Design a protein around this nucleic acid. Sequence first.
RNA 1: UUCACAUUGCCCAAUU
RNA 2: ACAUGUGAA
Length: 807
Amino acid sequence: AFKPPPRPDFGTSGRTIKLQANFFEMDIPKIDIYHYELDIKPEKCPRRVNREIVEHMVQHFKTQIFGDRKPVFDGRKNLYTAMPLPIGRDKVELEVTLPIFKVSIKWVSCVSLQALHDALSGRLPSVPFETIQALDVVMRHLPSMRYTPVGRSFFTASEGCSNPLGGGREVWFGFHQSVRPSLWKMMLNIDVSATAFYKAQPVIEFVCEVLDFKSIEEQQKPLTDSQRVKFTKEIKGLKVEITHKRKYRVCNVTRRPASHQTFPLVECTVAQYFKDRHKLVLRYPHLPCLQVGQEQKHTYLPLEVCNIVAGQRCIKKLTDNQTSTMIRATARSAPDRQEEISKLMRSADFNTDPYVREFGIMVKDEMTDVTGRVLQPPSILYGGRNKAIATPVQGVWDMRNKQFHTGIEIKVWAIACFAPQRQCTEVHLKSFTEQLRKISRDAGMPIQGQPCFCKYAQGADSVEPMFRHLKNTYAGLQLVVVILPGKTPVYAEVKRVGDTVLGMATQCVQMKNVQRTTPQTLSNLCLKINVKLGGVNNILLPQGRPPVFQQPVIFLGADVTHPPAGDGKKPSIAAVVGSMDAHPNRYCATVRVQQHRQEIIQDLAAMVRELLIQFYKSTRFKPTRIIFYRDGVSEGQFQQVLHHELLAIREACIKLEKDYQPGITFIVVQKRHHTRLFCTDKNERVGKSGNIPAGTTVDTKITHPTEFDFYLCSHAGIQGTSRPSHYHVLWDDNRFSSDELQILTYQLCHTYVRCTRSVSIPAPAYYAHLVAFRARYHLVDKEGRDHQALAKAVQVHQDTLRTMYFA
RNA sequence: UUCACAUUGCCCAAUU
RNA sequence: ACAUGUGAA
Ligand SMILES: [Mg+2]
Ligand SMILES: [Mg+2]
């Protein structure tokens, strides 16, 4: 379970395409640089405050130490210099004042950039991490002070334009920046981005925006408890500033107006306090005060003397309208984004950055050219009379004149309509039934007759007794179609009951899609229905599959989904699916709740054991090979994850049978990186968005210098700029060639049963996502006693276990 | 809750 | 994910 396998070869399959990547070559000197350890007492202050401390510590202690040396700082404890500092080894206490801190500098090490060159070439097997870290600290030292750092990105108010969102928020533009080793050179990965920020405005104006006032004096009355509570929820936690210089965090909003609100000086009011001490009379005395600092003390500031501090990211969720405006502001086609990144890099002036130039680094201002190959799509085989073969074109095909490979005859089914009768009439339901049966017969999934049961219902409470009744009354019941009036808790209840309480197949459909049907929608609905009932929609043309299918092989997809920002004990959800036939088409699912924000799948061995057992029951084969697509592990966790999960896989094998030792291939799938690929030639641009065509593959130039990784953009780019999926092979007993693995991955992107399209990641990974999503629905408002309760929540019924209920 | 693609959390990141 | 867009037999 040690080091990732070396790249075995380069891919040769498919026609070439000229591409540009948002990677900008770096020239790094062949020079040793110097790494010093810093400790700033006390180390509780924000990273930025530390950065300032060091920043003018260097200014204040210029004479003795640095002497024209321009150090870079990571913001916490790491300092780097281009040539060695005068303090030969010895920790030195330094005294720094801020307009109070002791800073100790001690030598740590030498970082050789020559060793980095050696790693980029053949000579070193590994890329020296410390070196990359050093370069990264160098490159982001200045913009960490100039701009507002968010993660690996930087944001700023765009000078000359405003993009308000309302509610005191506006769009800030910026960019992601990262330093990456490559087959060719050190690369600077730069992408543009945008995010909502709080406006740097007076608090009075903030109040007006949040409470929807065109101006204050609507009214000159204290706010209603409603208004005050909304304002409270909006400003709580934000930083404000005064002029009397002072910055505070807002912990509350007083109930009383400033004229009435009092504190112990003897009881003294806030307004009067400002009159007496600060010679100020409140223009808006009827308004509340912000409570700032510790909520235990009693420090209360009037609204009209405070400003919202500049550069605070808006953490809180945006409204629907705010979001709409955000999208509208930041939407760019592929060529537009390409031009924006290029414009940004020409206007960046990285090479005049005094710290960059101090470390002798040069950055290229043009995107790297890279040659991709466009893989051929697999043929898709259908069934019926035709045995039709479909040929994807630009990552899309369709169901017209085709029947499912194996279509289910639906004989017994029901309809529960939770939409109101007056809006979703019996005529609507009838007409919808007619249409659905037409499309379904065309597809080889004949709904033989009318539903056996069709009643209206209201509220979540009616779900369980209705479903119990159905299961007890109609023998051979295959499906319940559930019509919903849009967003409702009923959906989650329908799933809790069907999936985990009764083990019944349900298909939900929104009221509006019953009222107005279209062939495309009903067709997609049929994809879902056929799968849920155990059917096989289509299969990869068998003779067109890579040689790996010549022996029994199981395809696993795995994902962990974590709770959103904020809520803190809500668990993470681990989901693993495995193929159950040779096509591969049918999948079974396993799911677990696990520790909050843990990425490592804790219970993997038990899950894989289950899947292996089910695979044997379905196919009567034991897999000689296990292909494991693992979604969403970042590089910094590669070793962590691979160590636990690979072993878990082995354990599942070992405990199942000895000496059962199938070859394992462990592939990390990453859809959330910042690598963008653009057509160099305009006539290669596909559709309105002008993206690279589906099947575009890149395994040279910008990829890893020694390891086995590649980009594959398997999908049609409909809108904006495509995200090409990245695949990183952490382990491979099966000794794949690049060609076979890339082609296999591509083909798996065509087995996804919910649409006749090639999807952005292989089917097993996608299914993993759907399973986790469904689990999250089983857990809504539910968050060993506790953990057992949550584990119970996501446990499907016995009859649901062997199904694709997640489709 | 027909579906994909894209933006986006979340892993890794980040003295009144 | 939700939310928001763009689309489809
Ligand atoms: Mg995940
Ligand atoms: Mg949506």
